[PDB]
Amino acid sequence: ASIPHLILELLKCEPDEPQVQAKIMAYLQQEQANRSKHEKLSTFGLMCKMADQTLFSIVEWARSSIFFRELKVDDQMKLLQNCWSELLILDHIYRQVVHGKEGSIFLVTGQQVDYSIIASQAGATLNNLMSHAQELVAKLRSLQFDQREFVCLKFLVLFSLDVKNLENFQLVEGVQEQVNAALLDYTMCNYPQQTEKFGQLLLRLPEIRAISMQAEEYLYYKHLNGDVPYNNLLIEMLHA
């Protein structure tokens, strides 16, 4: 594989997935083990704790990128507030592409779960969102979506051109153009059989964003109705 130098630098920012998976699994096990039989976290409550912990990993990933670090905290907050849910969904989708089997759901804790089991515990909204995500998983697997392209899409999601009120919007513009050019060069060069792959990759970002917008609004209102157990970071991202 011929990898643009920029993409190699982007990959250095990826967390140690095996270690992240273990740490979140121990946290969720200590959570259930620290309460009795009557107050055990519901499946929904566990997913909230899971997403909450994933958000910590996302924040630490962003702050590990040099480009992100050149921005002041106000700018960093504005970028992360605009895309945290999209990053969560994109991460979940990629996880199904890699460690995924059709009919199953692979979680950030490394647990493999049957799709129909989880789906039957969700309402109409999350069922529709989960099913739409699975359709994206299938489309991306057929395109041979790989880790190099994944990291590129993550940076394109983080450094969005639609975030307003930034001090250093120029840095955000420059990152978007650089990653776009690197991703195009990488995809066209490593997947010549899948022509228009690059265009099909970018066409999926608006779908992933739409899914994550609905998911965020659902959680926000579930929290207002008191259905969301306390998850500091997740709650705080919603209450903004």
Partner: peptide, 10 residues
């Protein structure tokens, strides 16, 4: 947004 600000400063 206090906790996110702390995470990015820590």
């Amino acid at each position: 947004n206090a906790l996110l600000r702390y995470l990015l400063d820590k």
